[PDB]
Design a binder for this molecule. Structure first.
Ligand SMILES: [Mg+2]
Ligand SMILES: [Mg+2]
Ligand SMILES: [Mg+2]
Ligand SMILES: [Mg+2]
Ligand SMILES: [Mg+2]
Ligand SMILES: [Mg+2]
Ligand SMILES: [Mg+2]
Ligand SMILES: [Mg+2]
Ligand SMILES: [Mg+2]
Ligand SMILES: [Mg+2]
Ligand SMILES: [Mg+2]
Ligand SMILES: [Mg+2]
Ligand SMILES: [Mg+2]
Ligand SMILES: [Mg+2]
Ligand SMILES: [Mg+2]
Ligand SMILES: [Mg+2]
Ligand SMILES: [Mg+2]
Ligand SMILES: [Mg+2]
Ligand SMILES: [Mg+2]
Ligand SMILES: [Mg+2]
Ligand SMILES: [Mg+2]
Ligand SMILES: [Mg+2]
Ligand SMILES: [Mg+2]
Ligand SMILES: [Mg+2]
Ligand SMILES: [Mg+2]
Ligand SMILES: [Mg+2]
Ligand SMILES: [Mg+2]
Ligand SMILES: [Mg+2]
Ligand SMILES: [Mg+2]
Ligand SMILES: [Mg+2]
Ligand SMILES: [Mg+2]
Ligand SMILES: [Mg+2]
Ligand SMILES: [Mg+2]
Ligand SMILES: [Mg+2]
Ligand SMILES: [Mg+2]
Ligand SMILES: [Mg+2]
Ligand SMILES: [Mg+2]
Ligand SMILES: [Mg+2]
Ligand SMILES: [Mg+2]
Ligand SMILES: [Mg+2]
Lengths: 280, 278, 278, 280
């Protein structure tokens, strides 16, 4: 399936890591950020603007696309976007404004779109742009904590709503104290891409590894479980399966149909975790 | 300073490194590869097709976008494309973009049935072809051969598309530091950078470092990283020249005369054509 | 676990790296070289002499310890020493120790007029010769040749003196990680360790790493450093085998049969005798 | 001249840097430390012992040489050595005891010598052993501060007394504000081996670089100044000398004849520094 989004973010994540510490990342990566948003939105004319502490934009663009006019801070789209911290569209001398907002609610920057074609001017594309902008904002703010894990969860919740993209959450319960340490080792070993992991003990005292796969469909997670069973068979041979080593696999999909209510049930009732271990 | 292409390729390289080795890369990444091309061309209807060893396309698509009609392998645009190993446009389909590596093997075919008028131009065709060519390379003396293939790619990017690359040649003249300094230099490598260790005709260590999709100016980040790594090992006070490091730079751009690069590598750096192909 | 010899050589290597290139190394370090030998033999009266291209010693000493008498080049101990290229003792002088590199070129001569009875034995002669041989090397395909010279040294240390060395062969089987992992492995190199990048007969990256004056057991520090560097890049969770790294170990000791090392390099590692000499 | 001592310490310094952080350095390098002391003292029978917080030795040796007898904590040499923190000799069932003592006065370890030959049983060799033991103790305690610099100075003072080895102290005064920044850059560049450097401003407001060459004779420093003039001619050509760029070279030798009294005069009166900049 189409993993261009994860791929784009992994690539950008690598770029950020290669940055010389001299210069704010928003400034260094401005043109790249705008280009990525333009690629995802099929944008024709747009600008990328720093947003100040007072939630107003700096009108001198960090980067522009096409013949972008001077930014008008009185524009209704600009004002509604920055006041509410949400994507806004005419669906104003602009067509859509997308804020780059981190999970703490802080607006780092603003994408103002002057022109984008009718065939991408819709809630599906708007959602993609919003997801990409929020994930970029998260990356810009970055330099196994339960605290951090909870933030990644929050982002995936934001991703999942509306025309938004789902995420998958695995809970590997190590019910057999004999093969517990071993199996946990295999599991952490298998992190790849954007996987995020957290080690906990459930209410039975058993080791539980939570694995969040952001921006991952059911099809994408089925594949994840298969890479896993592959590795399992690499250390332990084909004879034995994960389930034979006392591993209980629980799965929850973050999608449009559910939200924080169902996420808590899964974690606190099905997984035997508590509100103090993971913050929903 | 727009690094989106480099960033897209870096993401792809990571997806590749971390897939199970049971599925051929083209097949596992098809939908992803088509999505990326579609973004670069604002494509609306298109298909991605495997090309066989004999420059014929398999009929059944690896991925499609929009209501893509059945591919007609006898299509004028298709045949001319696969015959030339090059992007062809109508200046039934609108554009064909082959995915061809630096050796000329066609891995796949992008068949475009519909894209908007406002992107139906050479600047856009250029981008599609560059992206296609770098994807093909990702999907495809061993070390010297690899380096020369990548060098060839950057020569294409530059002459065919006006996209820059930067080549550094580091000569290490002090045998007392050469080994260690060489390894430090190598540690400066960014994601898509490629490098080659050599001995020149004076017996000296030479490191060639190619920065694709990078201008002489935009390679200042690379150099800064390099000066940081050195300063960590030897202190911020010690100069690279005191360690016997000579630095030479060569920017790849459509501008150079066609003998310059050969002059730089063979005549200035004292290398030969069993070490690097130009 | 006594690393004093390695530490003495490391200090010498640094003195060398940081002298101005106007003075020949033997001459600038003479007093230092004699002091070190004198320590290893509890020498009381001795001289250090340059040996000419024709295996004759220059009469005037580079350095002396105690009331060293004029050197008689016709001295039985001197001639036999320089003729053999080996340490000779009286079992006018007591011991002659040549400084000879792995190619058999005699750089210098240690002439001992007096040392105590309690150190006049093979165990001591052994140490003097090992020290002398490693100093000579410091004072003296280019990379493959260098590596094979060092390999030869460690074979001498082991067979002539019962001093251990350890050889690791790392084969990188996953092309997706090979380049990066190779560089990480190379970063594990300690002061006097020597290493060589190769491609085996299956086309795979191979890193050979020699740890002189190091036992299989005492090479655990090296491995630990290696596992720390990997854990920094890939996390403490990721296994080297998951990155396609195969590790083989070969301990150099007087014990192996004389065909083992050749079997290990050529037959097990798939290398050839243009890549490594055994 | 004979730089075996500096060489030994540079080598040991490199060994310590190669150590995996897992294990106290005294424990990891014990055999090497004992071997180095044995090499410098021509020792025949000896042991290396940890010294505890209470200034008593742990009788189980970290390392031994020859047929070393059990350590007797009642031995007069052992007791006098540890009580005074100084080398002691019969010049007791032992012949000499050398404490490994850092500049803060802390005894890390003890070298007990059962047998060493008459031809090294003398104050010259005793001094060498003491210097080596103190320098090793300093290295064991290590993980441009004026505070650190002052410690290095103190060690060289300790080194210089009695049958001890001298050190040289350079003070490069940059009298010409035109070529000041440039020349200072060259000077810091030239640190090699055990050089220790400190940047200060003197009482005229001029940049002054202090350079301490530990365990360095006058002959050894003459060579240092020549490496320097060589580098100077590398950046600035042969035409101009250091002195033409406003560099005033002051020199003081730490030797047996002087001590802290003369060191202060040089620093505070000839160099125009003060007691607050460097602590003598
Ligand atoms: Mg993109
Ligand atoms: Mg107004
Ligand atoms: Mg409008
Ligand atoms: Mg619980
Ligand atoms: Mg659901
Ligand atoms: Mg770029
Ligand atoms: Mg990508
Ligand atoms: Mg396959
Ligand atoms: Mg096909
Ligand atoms: Mg499809
Ligand atoms: Mg190397
Ligand atoms: Mg590099
Ligand atoms: Mg790197
Ligand atoms: Mg570019
Ligand atoms: Mg770049
Ligand atoms: Mg950069
Ligand atoms: Mg760099
Ligand atoms: Mg720079
Ligand atoms: Mg060119
Ligand atoms: Mg070639
Ligand atoms: Mg050793
Ligand atoms: Mg030494
Ligand atoms: Mg010379
Ligand atoms: Mg001579
Ligand atoms: Mg002499
Ligand atoms: Mg490399
Ligand atoms: Mg290594
Ligand atoms: Mg290293
Ligand atoms: Mg050894
Ligand atoms: Mg060792
Ligand atoms: Mg070690
Ligand atoms: Mg290591
Ligand atoms: Mg280990
Ligand atoms: Mg052997
Ligand atoms: Mg060879
Ligand atoms: Mg020694
Ligand atoms: Mg008592
Ligand atoms: Mg006694
Ligand atoms: Mg002052
Ligand atoms: Mg004096």
């Amino acid at each position: 399936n189409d993993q261009s989004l994860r791929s784009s973010l992994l690539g950008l994540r690598q770029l950020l890591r290669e940055l010389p510490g001299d210069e704010a990342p928003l400034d260094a990566l401005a043109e790249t950020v705008l280009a990525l948003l333009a690629q995802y939105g099929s944008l024709r004319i747009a600008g990328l603007y720093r947003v100040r502490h007072d939630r107003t934009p700096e009108p001198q663009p960090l980067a522009t696309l096409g013949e972008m006019p001077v930014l008008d801070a009185d524009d209704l789209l600009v004002r509604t976007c920055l006041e509410r911290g949400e994507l806004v569209s005419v669906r104003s001398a602009l067509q859509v404004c997308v804020p780059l907002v981190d999970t703490d609610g802080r607006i780092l920057a603003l994408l103002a779109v002057e022109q984008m074609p009718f065939f991408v001017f819709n809630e599906r594309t708007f959602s993609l742009l919003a997801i990409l902008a929020g994930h970029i904002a998260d990356l810009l703010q970055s330099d196994i904590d339960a605290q951090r894990f909870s933030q990644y969860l929050k982002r995936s919740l934001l991703d999942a709503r509306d025309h938004g993209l789902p995420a998958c959450l695995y809970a590997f319960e190590l019910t057999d104290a004999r093969y517990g340490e071993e199996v946990q080792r295999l599991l952490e070993g298998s992190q790849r891409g954007l996987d995020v992991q957290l080690r906990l003990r459930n209410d039975e005292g058993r080791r539980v590894l939570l694995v969040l796969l952001p921006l991952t469909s059911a099809e994408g997670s089925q594949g994840y479980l298969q890479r896993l069973r592959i590795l399992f068979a690499e250390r332990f041979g084909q004879a034995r399966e994960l389930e034979s080593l006392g591993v209980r696999i629980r799965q929850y999909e973050l999608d449009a149909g559910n939200d924080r209510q169902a996420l808590g049930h899964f974690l606190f009732n099905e997984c035997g975790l508590n509100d103090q271990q993971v913050a929903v």
